[PDB]
């Protein structure tokens, strides 16, 4: 019980755009852990084939709601804390 | 061919953070993010900057660490806030 939570155990409430993306891949709740948000976002990119076939770390999301999520027409999966920045801007960390 | 994780990312700490890391016996200029967290944890523990009753509260007023955070205190529970301070104090070797 007295065990501290890691960042991936943080409970979050995605704002409507991020919530819709998570629900589109089968998630059926309004509150998630950061780990579940990362899991479902990766499942979303993969299912919708938004990554470039030849350079698979580049995501092209100009005609997808994911582009609105990031505020850019494309992005790189190598930029770890930039992706966390965009995720945190699309959710409320629950008290 | 194996992609690096965030913890394996190489960084070049800026002068203030570099001084902090070197003060606990780290003797290099390039670090992984894992090493930065390790030596920062060592610094807080060696200088006992935490509140003895609420050990997630770190006090850093009139200290090199308070210069980095731009604040007299912070809580370890707010993971992203700590990463934001660290990234502002380094250059990623990308």
């Amino acid at each position: 019980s007295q065990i501290p939570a890691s960042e991936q155990e943080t409970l979050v409430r995605p704002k409507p755009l991020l919530l819709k993306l998570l629900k589109s891949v089968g998630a059926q709740k309004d509150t998630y852990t950061m780990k579940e948000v990362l899991f479902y976002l990766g499942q979303y990119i993969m299912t919708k084939r938004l990554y470039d076939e030849k350079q698979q770390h580049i995501v092209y999301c100009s005609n997808d709601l994911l582009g609105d999520l990031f505020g850019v027409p494309s992005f790189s999966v190598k930029e770890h804390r930039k992706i966390y920045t965009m995720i945190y801007r699309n959710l409320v960390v629950v008290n | 061919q194996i992609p690096a994780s965030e913890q394996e990312t190489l960084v070049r700490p800026k002068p203030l953070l570099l001084k902090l890391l070197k003060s606990v016996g780290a003797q290099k200029d390039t670090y992984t993010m894992k090493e930065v967290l390790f030596y920062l944890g060592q610094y807080i523990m060696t200088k006992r900057l935490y509140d003895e009753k609420q050990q997630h509260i770190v006090y850093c007023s009139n200290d090199l660490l308070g210069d980095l955070f731009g604040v007299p205190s912070f809580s370890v529970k707010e993971h992203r806030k700590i990463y934001t301070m660290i990234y502002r104090n380094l250059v990623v070797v990308n």
Partner: peptide, 11 residues
Amino acid sequence: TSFCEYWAXXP
């Protein structure tokens, strides 16, 4: 390297 490998190397 694949998308899934890039994504696994941030869950």
